[PDB]
Coordinates of C-alpha atoms in Angstrom, one line a residue:
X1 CA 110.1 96.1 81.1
X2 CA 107.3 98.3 81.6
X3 CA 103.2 97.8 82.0
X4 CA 100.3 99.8 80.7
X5 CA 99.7 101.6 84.3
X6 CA 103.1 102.4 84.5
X7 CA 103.1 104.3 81.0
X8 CA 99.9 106.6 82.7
X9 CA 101.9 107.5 85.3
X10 CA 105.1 108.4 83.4
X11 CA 102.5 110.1 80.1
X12 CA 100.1 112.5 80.7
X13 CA 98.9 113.8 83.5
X14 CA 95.5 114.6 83.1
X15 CA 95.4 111.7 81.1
X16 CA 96.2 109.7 84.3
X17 CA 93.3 111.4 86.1
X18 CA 90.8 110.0 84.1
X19 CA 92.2 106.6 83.6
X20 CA 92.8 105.5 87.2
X21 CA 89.9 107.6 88.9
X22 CA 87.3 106.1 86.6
X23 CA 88.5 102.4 87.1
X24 CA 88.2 103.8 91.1
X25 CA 84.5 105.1 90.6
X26 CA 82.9 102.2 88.9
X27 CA 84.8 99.7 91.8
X28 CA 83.4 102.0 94.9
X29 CA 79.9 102.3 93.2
X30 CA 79.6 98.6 93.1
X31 CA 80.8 98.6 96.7
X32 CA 78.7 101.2 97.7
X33 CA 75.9 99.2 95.4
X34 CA 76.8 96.2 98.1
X35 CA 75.6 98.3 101.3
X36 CA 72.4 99.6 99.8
X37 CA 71.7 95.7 99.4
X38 CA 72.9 94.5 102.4
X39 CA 70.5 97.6 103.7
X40 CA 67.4 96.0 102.6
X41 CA 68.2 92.7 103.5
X42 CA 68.9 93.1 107.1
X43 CA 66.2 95.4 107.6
X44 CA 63.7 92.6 107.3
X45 CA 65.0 90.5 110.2
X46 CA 63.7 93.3 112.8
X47 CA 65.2 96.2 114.7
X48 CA 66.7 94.3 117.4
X49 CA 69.6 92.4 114.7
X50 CA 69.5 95.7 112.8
X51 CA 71.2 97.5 116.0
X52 CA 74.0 94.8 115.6
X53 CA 75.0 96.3 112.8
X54 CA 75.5 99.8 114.4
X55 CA 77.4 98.2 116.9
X56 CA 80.1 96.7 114.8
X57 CA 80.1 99.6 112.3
X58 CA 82.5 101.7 114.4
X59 CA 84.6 98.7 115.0
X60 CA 84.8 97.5 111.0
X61 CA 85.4 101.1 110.0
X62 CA 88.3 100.9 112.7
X63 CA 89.7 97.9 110.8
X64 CA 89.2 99.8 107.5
X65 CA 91.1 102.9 109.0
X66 CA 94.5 101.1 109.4
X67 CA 94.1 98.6 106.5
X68 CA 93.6 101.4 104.4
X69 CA 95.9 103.6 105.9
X70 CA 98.7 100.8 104.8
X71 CA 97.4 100.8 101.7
X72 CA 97.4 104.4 100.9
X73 CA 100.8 104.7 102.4
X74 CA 101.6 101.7 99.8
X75 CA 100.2 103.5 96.8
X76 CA 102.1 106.8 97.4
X77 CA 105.7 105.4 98.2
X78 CA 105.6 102.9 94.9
X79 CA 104.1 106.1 93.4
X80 CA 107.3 108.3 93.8
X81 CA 109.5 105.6 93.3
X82 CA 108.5 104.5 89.8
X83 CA 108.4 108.5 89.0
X84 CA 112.2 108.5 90.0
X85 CA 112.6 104.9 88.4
X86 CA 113.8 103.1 91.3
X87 CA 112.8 100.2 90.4
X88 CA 114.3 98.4 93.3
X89 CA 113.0 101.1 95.6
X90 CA 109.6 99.9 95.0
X91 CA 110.0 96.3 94.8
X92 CA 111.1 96.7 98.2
X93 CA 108.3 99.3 99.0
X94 CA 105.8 96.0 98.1
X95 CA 107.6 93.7 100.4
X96 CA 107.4 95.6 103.3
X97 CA 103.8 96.2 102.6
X98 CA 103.3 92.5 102.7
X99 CA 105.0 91.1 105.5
X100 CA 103.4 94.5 107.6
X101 CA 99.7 93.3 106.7
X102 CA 100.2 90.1 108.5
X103 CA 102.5 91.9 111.7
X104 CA 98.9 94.5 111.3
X105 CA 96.5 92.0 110.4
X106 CA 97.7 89.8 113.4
X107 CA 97.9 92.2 115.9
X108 CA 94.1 93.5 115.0
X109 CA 93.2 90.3 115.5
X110 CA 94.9 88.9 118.6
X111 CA 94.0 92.7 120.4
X112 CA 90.4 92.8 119.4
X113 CA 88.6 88.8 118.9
X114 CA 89.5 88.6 122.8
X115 CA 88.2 91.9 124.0
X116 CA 85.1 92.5 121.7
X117 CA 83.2 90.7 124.4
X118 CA 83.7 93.5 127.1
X119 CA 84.0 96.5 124.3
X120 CA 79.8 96.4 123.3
X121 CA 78.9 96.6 127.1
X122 CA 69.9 92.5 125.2
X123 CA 69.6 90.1 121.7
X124 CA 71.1 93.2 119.5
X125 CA 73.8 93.3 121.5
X126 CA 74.3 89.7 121.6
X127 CA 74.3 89.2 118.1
X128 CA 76.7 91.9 117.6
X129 CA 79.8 89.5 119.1
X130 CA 78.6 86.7 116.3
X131 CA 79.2 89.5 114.1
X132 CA 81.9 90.8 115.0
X133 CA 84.3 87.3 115.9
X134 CA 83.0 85.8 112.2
X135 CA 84.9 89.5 110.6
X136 CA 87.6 89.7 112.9
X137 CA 88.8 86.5 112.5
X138 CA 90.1 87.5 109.1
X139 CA 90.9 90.8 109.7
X140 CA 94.5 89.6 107.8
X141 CA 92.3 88.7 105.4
X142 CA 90.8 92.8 105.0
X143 CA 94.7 94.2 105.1
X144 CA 96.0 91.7 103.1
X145 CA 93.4 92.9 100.0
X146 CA 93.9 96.5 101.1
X147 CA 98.1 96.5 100.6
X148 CA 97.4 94.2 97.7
X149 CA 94.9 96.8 96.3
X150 CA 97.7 99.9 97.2
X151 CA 100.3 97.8 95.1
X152 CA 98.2 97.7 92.0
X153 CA 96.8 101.1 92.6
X154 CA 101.0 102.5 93.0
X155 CA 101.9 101.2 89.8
X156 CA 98.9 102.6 88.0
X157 CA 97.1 99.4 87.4
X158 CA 94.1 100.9 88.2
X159 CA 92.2 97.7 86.2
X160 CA 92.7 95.1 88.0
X161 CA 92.4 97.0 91.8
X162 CA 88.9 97.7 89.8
X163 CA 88.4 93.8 89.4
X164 CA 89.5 93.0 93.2
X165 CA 86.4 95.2 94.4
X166 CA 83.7 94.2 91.3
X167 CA 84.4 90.8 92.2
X168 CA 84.9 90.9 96.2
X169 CA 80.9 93.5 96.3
X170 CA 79.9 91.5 93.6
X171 CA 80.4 88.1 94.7
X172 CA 79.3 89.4 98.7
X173 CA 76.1 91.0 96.5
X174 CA 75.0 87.4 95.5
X175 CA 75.9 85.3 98.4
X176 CA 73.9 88.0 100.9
X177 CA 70.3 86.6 100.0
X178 CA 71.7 83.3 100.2
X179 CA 73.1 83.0 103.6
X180 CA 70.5 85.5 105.2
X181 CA 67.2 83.8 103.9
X182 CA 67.9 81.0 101.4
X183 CA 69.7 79.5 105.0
X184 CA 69.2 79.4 108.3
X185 CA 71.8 82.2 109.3
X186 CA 70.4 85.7 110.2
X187 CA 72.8 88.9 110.4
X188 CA 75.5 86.6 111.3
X189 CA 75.0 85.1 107.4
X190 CA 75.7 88.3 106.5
X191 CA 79.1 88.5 108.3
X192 CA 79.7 85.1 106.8
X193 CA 79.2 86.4 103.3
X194 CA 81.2 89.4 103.5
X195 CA 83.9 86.8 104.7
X196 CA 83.8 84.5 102.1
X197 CA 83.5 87.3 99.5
X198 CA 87.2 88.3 101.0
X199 CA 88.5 84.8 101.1
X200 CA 87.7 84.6 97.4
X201 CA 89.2 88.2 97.0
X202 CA 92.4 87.1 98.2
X203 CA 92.9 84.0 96.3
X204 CA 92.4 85.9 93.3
X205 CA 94.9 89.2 94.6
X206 CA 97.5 86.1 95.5
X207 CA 97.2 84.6 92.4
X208 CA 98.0 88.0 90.6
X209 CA 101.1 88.9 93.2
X210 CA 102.8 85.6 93.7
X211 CA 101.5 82.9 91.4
X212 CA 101.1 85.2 88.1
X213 CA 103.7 87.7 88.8
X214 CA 102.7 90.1 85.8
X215 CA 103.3 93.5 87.9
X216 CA 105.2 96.3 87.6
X217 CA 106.9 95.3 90.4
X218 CA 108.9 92.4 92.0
X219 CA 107.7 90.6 94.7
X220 CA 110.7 88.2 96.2
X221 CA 112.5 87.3 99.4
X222 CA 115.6 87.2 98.2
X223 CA 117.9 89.6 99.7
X224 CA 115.3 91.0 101.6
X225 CA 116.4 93.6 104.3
X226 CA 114.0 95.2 106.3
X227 CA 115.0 98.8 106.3
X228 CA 114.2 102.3 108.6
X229 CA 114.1 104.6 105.1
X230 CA 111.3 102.0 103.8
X231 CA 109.1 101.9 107.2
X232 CA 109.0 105.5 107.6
X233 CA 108.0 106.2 104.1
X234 CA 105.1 104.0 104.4
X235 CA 104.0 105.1 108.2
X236 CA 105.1 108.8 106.9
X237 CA 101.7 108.6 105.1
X238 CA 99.9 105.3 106.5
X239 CA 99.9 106.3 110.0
X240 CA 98.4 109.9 109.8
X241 CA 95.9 108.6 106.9
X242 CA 94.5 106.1 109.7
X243 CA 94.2 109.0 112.3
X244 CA 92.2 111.2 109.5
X245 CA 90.1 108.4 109.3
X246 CA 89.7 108.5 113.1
X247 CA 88.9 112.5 113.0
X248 CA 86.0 111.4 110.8
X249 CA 84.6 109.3 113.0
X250 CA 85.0 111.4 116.5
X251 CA 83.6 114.1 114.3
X252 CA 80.3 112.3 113.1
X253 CA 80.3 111.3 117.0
X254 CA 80.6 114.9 118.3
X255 CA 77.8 116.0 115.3
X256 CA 75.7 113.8 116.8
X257 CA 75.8 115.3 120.1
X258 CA 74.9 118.3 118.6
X259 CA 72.3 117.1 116.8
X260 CA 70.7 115.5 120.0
X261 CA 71.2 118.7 121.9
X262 CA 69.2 120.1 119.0
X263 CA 66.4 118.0 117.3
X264 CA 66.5 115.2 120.1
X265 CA 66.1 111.5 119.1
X266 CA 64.3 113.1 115.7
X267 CA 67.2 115.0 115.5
X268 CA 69.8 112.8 115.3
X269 CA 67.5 110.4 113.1
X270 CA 67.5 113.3 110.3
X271 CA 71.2 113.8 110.5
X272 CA 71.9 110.2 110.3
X273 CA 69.9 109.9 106.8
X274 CA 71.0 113.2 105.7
X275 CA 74.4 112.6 106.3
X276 CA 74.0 108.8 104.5
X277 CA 72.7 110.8 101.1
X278 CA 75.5 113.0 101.0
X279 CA 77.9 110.6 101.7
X280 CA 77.2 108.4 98.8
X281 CA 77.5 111.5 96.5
X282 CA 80.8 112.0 97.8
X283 CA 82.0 108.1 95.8
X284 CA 83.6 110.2 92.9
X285 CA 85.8 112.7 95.3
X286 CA 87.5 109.5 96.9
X287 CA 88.0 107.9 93.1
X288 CA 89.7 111.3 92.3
X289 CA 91.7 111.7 95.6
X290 CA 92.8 108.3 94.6
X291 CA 94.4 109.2 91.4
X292 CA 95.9 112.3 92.5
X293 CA 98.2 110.6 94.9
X294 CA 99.1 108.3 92.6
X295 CA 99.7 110.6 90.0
X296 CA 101.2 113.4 91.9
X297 CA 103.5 111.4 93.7
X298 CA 104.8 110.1 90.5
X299 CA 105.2 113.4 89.1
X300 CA 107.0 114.1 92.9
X301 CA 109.3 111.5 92.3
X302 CA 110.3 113.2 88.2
X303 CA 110.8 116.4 89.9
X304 CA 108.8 117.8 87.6
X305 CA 106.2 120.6 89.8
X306 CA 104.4 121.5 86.9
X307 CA 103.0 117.8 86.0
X308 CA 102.2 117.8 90.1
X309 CA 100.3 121.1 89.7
X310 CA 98.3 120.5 86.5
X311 CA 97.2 117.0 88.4
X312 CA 96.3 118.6 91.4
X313 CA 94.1 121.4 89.5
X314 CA 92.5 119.1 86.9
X315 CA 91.4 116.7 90.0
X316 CA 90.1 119.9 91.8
X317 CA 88.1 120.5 88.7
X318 CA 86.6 117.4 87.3
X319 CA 85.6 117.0 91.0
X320 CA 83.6 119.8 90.9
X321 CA 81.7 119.7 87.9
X322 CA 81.0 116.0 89.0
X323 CA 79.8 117.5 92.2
X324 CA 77.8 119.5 90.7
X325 CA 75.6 117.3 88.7
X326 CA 75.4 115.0 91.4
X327 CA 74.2 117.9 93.9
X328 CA 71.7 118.8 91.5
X329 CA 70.1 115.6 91.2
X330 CA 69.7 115.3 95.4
X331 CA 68.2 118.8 95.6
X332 CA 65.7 119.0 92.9
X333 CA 64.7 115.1 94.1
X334 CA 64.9 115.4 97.7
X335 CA 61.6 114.2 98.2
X336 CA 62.7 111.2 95.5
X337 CA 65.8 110.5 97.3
X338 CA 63.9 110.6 101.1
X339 CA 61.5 107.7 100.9
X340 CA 64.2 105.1 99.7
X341 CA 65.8 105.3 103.0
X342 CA 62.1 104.5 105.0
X343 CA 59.7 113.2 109.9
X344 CA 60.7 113.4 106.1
X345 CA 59.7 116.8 106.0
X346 CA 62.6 118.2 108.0
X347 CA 65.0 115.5 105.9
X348 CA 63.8 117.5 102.7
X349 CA 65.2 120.7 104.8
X350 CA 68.7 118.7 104.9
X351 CA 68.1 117.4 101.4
X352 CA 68.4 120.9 100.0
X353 CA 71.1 122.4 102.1
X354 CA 73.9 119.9 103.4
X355 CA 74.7 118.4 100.0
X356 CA 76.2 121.7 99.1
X357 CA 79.9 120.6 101.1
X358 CA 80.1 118.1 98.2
X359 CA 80.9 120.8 96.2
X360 CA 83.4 122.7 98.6
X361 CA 84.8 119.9 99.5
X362 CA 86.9 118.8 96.4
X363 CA 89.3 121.6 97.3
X364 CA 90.3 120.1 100.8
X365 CA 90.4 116.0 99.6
X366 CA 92.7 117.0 96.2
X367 CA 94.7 119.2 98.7
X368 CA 94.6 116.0 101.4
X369 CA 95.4 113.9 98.4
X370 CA 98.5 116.1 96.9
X371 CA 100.3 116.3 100.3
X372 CA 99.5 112.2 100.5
X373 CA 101.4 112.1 97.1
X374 CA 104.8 114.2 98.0
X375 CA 104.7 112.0 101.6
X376 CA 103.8 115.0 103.9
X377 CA 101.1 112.9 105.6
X378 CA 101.0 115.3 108.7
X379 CA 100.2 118.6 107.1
X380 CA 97.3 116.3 105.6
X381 CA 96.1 115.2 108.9
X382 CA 96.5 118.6 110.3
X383 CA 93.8 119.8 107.1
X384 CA 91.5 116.6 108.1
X385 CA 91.5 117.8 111.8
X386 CA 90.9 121.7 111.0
X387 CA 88.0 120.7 108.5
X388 CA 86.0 117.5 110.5
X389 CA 87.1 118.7 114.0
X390 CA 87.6 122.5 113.8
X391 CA 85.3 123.7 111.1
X392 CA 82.7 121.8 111.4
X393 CA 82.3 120.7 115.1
X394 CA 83.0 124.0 115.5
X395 CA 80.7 126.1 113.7
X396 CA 78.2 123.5 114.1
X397 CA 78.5 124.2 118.3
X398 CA 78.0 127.5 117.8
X399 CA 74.9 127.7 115.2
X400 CA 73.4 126.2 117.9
X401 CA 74.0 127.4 121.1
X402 CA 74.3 131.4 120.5
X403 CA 72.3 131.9 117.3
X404 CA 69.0 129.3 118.3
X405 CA 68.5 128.2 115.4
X406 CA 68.2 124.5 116.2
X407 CA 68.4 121.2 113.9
X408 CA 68.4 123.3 111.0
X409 CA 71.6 125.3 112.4
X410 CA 73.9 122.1 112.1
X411 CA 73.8 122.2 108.1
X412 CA 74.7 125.6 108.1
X413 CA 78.0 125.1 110.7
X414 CA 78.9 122.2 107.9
X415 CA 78.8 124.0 104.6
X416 CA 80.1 127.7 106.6
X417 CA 82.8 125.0 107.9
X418 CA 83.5 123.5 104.9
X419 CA 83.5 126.9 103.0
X420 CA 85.9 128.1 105.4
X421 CA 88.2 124.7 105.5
X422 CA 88.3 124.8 101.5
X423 CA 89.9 128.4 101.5
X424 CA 92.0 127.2 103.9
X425 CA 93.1 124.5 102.2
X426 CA 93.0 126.0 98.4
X427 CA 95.2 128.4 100.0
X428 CA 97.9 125.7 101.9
X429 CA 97.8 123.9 98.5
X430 CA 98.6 126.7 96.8
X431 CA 101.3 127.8 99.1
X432 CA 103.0 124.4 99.2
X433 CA 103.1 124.3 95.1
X434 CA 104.7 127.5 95.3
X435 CA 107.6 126.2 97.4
X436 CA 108.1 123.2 95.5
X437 CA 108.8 125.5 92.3
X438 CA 111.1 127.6 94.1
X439 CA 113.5 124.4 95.2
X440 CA 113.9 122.4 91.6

């Protein structure tokens, strides 16, 4: 009784880095392939339903935060059970992770559909609470395919969590024309076909779980007993992966606050695009951050500290020669790169300086990753804060206020940030490696 993803976890460790980050990169390019075209499409209906968009943004990537947080904390806790083969350790790891998504997927809904109406307080506006009720609505929907996507990810069946986002971005890639211009729907079509897409999603997920039932894992309610050991594995890892999500987003909010005190409404417009370039370069880190939890905490749960090391520093390095190819190609075309997104001059500036944290970066997120995988989800919080909040708000605050060195000055805080939060975080890696050897 054993699958193929099972025998990656269990064989070769940097064997199992390439397998299930790969699967990862091609499934978030196609997602990230799904907001470049949902980019162009919405642009066309006019700046006023375009502003909708930014309105809901924080709130979706609030959904994503604790849907994803579940599923991480999902991933890693089937991750070191099926490394210890406790097989009935993770069946029950799966249940829980079910019957939570509707408690979480519930209480997103019944806390946020009623109060959305008072949390955006013109026609943007407006259209922002069409938007927002038509997602929110199945916001079990989003957690459901997130702890679905964890239990396939935790039991290294990497494929078909591939398949789940090819064919939810895929799917939402050919029913966004349609619903947008083909029909009479505006923005709000595009809310309706990000819905169906997940509808679809889920059928297909359910079918796999319950109606298939070819996982590594058993999903039953037979002698199911909800325990304390099983919930604070999960929230050990789910809750403080929702709250690093969170840092990300006051920290994008506080950099934009620098940014206005520094280039103005220019300013922050050059930030906002130089900090959407970068950020689609950074695709590949998340598909490796992936696999090192997965394959870490496996290696965790054999006791066996040398597999967890030779993981953690073969993610650290693939990541960076990735990194740097990808770096390359946004620097010597950052005049390429600038006029797909619609002063470009001072973008070019950005262009050629912030994509460098892609490169520094790999040595935090691994890090992040390899405390995810041994279910120490605080100390990676505590690196998340130190590097979004610390590190970079911090430097950032003061290359502009005591140096005057204006919108330029805010790339320089980032990468000195990020230089400093990757030492810092090499070196806590490191450290916490060391300890492991000396207790097996």
């Amino acid at each position: 009784k054993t699958t193929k993803g099972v025998q990656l976890l269990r064989g070769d460790p940097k064997k199992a880095i390439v397998r299930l980050s790969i699967p990862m990169m091609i499934g978030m390019s196609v997602q990230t392939l799904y907001n470049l075209a949902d980019g162009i499409w919405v642009s066309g209906l006019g700046p006023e339903s375009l502003a909708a968009v930014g309105l809901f943004f924080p709130v979706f990537m609030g959904i994503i935060a604790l849907a994803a947080g579940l599923g991480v904390g999902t991933s890693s806790a089937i991750a070191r059970r099926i490394g210890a083969r406790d097989k009935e350790g993770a069946d029950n790891v799966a249940v829980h992770s079910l019957i939570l998504s509707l408690i979480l997927g519930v209480t997103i809904t019944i806390t946020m559909l009623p109060a959305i109406d008072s949390l955006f307080r013109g026609e943007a506006v407006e259209l922002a609470i069409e938007y927002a009720r038509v997602l929110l609505a199945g916001a079990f929907i989003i957690v459901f395919n997130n702890v679905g996507n964890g239990i396939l990810r935790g039991e290294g069946d990497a494929n078909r969590a591939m398949l789940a986002m090819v064919l939810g971005s895929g799917l939402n890639i050919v029913l966004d024309p349609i619903f947008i211009y083909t029909l009479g729907f505006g923005v709000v079509g595009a809310a309706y076909a990000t819905l169906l897409s997940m509808v679809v999603t889920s059928l297909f997920i359910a079918y796999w779980l319950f109606v298939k039932r070819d996982t590594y894992v058993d999903i039953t309610l037979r002698d199911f007993s909800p325990s304390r050991e099983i919930l604070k594995d999960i929230l050990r890892v789910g809750l403080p992966s929702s709250l690093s999500q969170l840092s990300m987003s006051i920290a994008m909010f506080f950099l934009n606050s620098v940014a206005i005190t520094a280039g103005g409404e220019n300013g922050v417009a050059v930030f906002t695009s130089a900090w959407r370039i970068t950020m689609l370069g950074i695709v590949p880190i998340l598909g490796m951050a992936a696999a090192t939890t997965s394959v870490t905490g496996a290696a965790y749960g054999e006791r066996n500290v040398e597999k967890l090391e030779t993981a953690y520093l073969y993610a650290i390095k693939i990541a960076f020669m990735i990194e740097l190819a990808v770096v390359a190609f946004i620097m010597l075309f950052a005049p390429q790169v600038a006029y797909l997104f619609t002063i470009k001059g001072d973008l070019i500036s950005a262009l050629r300086t912030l994509p460098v944290f892609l490169v520094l970066t790999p040595f935090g997120m691994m890090t992040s990753a390899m405390f995810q995988g041994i279910g120490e989800g605080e100390k990676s919080l505590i690196l998340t804060i130190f590097r979004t909040l610390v590190m970079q708000v911090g430097f950032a605050y003061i290359f502009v206020h005591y140096t005057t060195l204006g919108l330029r000055g805010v790339w320089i805080g980032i990468v000195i940030g990020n230089m400093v939060a990757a030492i810092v975080g090499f070196l806590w890696g490191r450290m916490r490696i060391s300890a492991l050897k000396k207790t097996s």
